[PDB]
Amino acid sequence: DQPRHVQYATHFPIPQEESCSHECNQRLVVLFGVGKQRDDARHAIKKITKDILKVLNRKGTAETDQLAPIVPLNPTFLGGEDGQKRRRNRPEAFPTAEDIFAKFQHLSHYDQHQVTAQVSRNVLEQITSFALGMSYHLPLVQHVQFIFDLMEYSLSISGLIDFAIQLLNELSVVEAELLLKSSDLVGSYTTSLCLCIVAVLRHYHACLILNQDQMAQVFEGLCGVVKHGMNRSDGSSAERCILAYLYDLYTSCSHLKNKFGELFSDFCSKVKNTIYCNVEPSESNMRWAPEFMIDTLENPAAHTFTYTGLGKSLSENPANRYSFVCNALMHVCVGHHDPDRVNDIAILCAELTGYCKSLSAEWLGVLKALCCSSNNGTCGFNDLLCNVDVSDLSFHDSLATFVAILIARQCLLLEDLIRCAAIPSLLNAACSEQDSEPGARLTCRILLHLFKPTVGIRSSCDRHLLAASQNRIVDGAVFAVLKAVFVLGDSVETASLDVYAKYVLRSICQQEWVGERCLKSLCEDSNDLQDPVLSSAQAQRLMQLICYPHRLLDNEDGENPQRQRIKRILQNLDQWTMRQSSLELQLMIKQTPNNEMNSLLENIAKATIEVFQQSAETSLERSGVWLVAPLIAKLPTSVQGHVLKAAGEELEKGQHLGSSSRKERDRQKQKSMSLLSQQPFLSLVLTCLKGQDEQREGLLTSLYSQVH
């Protein structure tokens, strides 16, 4: 049939545009050959996407389009896919088309040019029409969500920088022509679309670093236009991550401004200075101040309210804790499990507390109350089990989705959970066994839901939100919360109760993002995993889980399972994971107790001397043992020096076996060379000859042995 190379003909993309107008456009077609299809392929590839925009550009109704599946006689499989697009009729929870899925499968960068040029003509015709004298209508938001969910299949890179370029350019045109009108519609749909571009560039962090020769200096131009004129509703959009994440560019030129405020000079200095030095918080306490029945008075639909006016309202009382927690939980037990309701209640309540950044440090009481008995009271929790169904887990996906929405705000800090949550959970099971027994398993499942057998879910836009916000928290103490899970232990439903304590060990490490953070963390330093809080036996029983998930499951076997565990640490590593393969040794070498340092030397010496004899008696696959020397070289030579100076004479005694026939002496020589024909022997003593005492005695014995 077909060979392998014909499938990759479509897998050769050209990312850079405008290569050669006369040459590259005209010469590329004739490589495959002639075809009527390819000429009509260009005729209808834009036609299928122009129709859906012309009813959006001109706001054409859907009732005027009925003859689109009726006219074309050819609906072939791509053409017939055009006709079925009118079978869905009304909008629904409809997946993408198979062709658009197939463009994610193959040819994702050839077609990325037309779709990015398709949206380029849409965003530029409006800017010639918004200023044409009639269009003062703000851009809609309902089409924004569906257009990022479909553009991401092409793996676009050029679609990010151009839109960021054009939006800052057009707003300077707006202020020169639309500032004097002074309307009240400013910032309702532009600021919402402002953070959409910022967040999608955060998911494309490689593209934002290559344009730094005008990135920083444009922000004074685009933000400074509103201040010099009569500024209405100040600036609705303010950048937050710029003044903290950028460090390198300020060494060129640094300048100061003096147009902030009489008491806001220190305030707006700290608006830019958000790196450290937290100011003194709200001294008035925020515990049990609101009682009940206050959410009906306020309307979050009116977006015209401001953060500055919110300060005077909360200056009277910081009372935004209790009456909204009860309002939220009473509402969610009224509404159904439909996806529209559960996502909206998290995001609408978010902007109430989004500018209430002091409210971000008081949410611990929803878990601190049930964890400890310092709150006292027994009847306060019985109703909280009356409204919880523990048997059903399909509706626990919604609260698993809520905490994904809760972590997606990127301004809620969970650094209190390291100190005051995982540590007493050790003593929670230690002090009480039959009383707080659900506390171990309830904290087991909810942390799994934070870091999600598996089934392929269609969700992709919010699926990538969990890993994007993961690295925003430092990795200094997060694994201490992880280890506190592991040290506490010391058909899915068919499993019994006791076996779940062991599958959680695998399932936590099953996530590829869990494993890769531990692998990268040791690249800088290992002092954080040598803390005496960490366990002895349980630490290295999961290093083989840390290193690779797709390896075969090693089994507990025999009276001496560590005997074969020492003997396979050479074979299991390959010639490509050379970084962490030697890193696992010095952790378990130092974990070995001091009473058996003597037995811990000759094992690694003799491990490398029967790795050569099985090829002596009877290339790139065998290049791994031909290149174990880089692993040995990146080791403390105090251990290496004693075990390799011992390796010399035991391989210089391998040829010294006589007391038999003359002819067997020659065979035991040449079998010894075939296991001693390794250039790494010359390099292992090369490490050893630095920082040694004397090793000239061993080769004296060989010289004398053969001189006769």
Swiss-Prot record:
It comes from the Eukaryota. The modification Phosphoserine is found at residue 491. Residues 650-669 have a biased composition (Basic and acidic residues). Residues 650-674 are annotated as: Disordered. It is found in: Nucleus. Component of the Mediator complex, which is composed of MED1, MED4, MED6, MED7, MED8, MED9, MED10, MED11, MED12, MED13, MED13L, MED14, MED15, MED16, MED17, MED18, MED19, MED20, MED21, MED22, MED23, MED24, MED25, MED26, MED27, MED29, MED30, MED31, CCNC, CDK8 and CDC2L6/CDK11. The MED12, MED13, CCNC and CDK8 subunits form a distinct module termed the CDK8 module. Mediator containing the CDK8 module is less active than Mediator lacking this module in supporting transcriptional activation. It is linked to Opitz-Kaveggia syndrome: X-linked disorder characterized by intellectual disability, relative macrocephaly, hypotonia and constipation. Intellectual developmental disorder, X-linked, syndromic, Lujan-Fryns type: A disorder characterized by tall stature with asthenic habitus, macrocephaly, a tall narrow face, maxillary hypoplasia, a high narrow palate with dental crowding, a small or receding chin, long hands with hyperextensible digits, hypernasal speech, hypotonia, mild-to-moderate intellectual disability, behavioral aberrations and dysgenesis of the corpus callosum. Belongs to the Mediator complex subunit 12 family. This is Mediator of RNA polymerase II transcription subunit 12. The lineage of its organism: Eukaryota, Metazoa, Chordata, Craniata, Vertebrata. The chain holds residues 727 to 1508 of 2177 of the full protein.
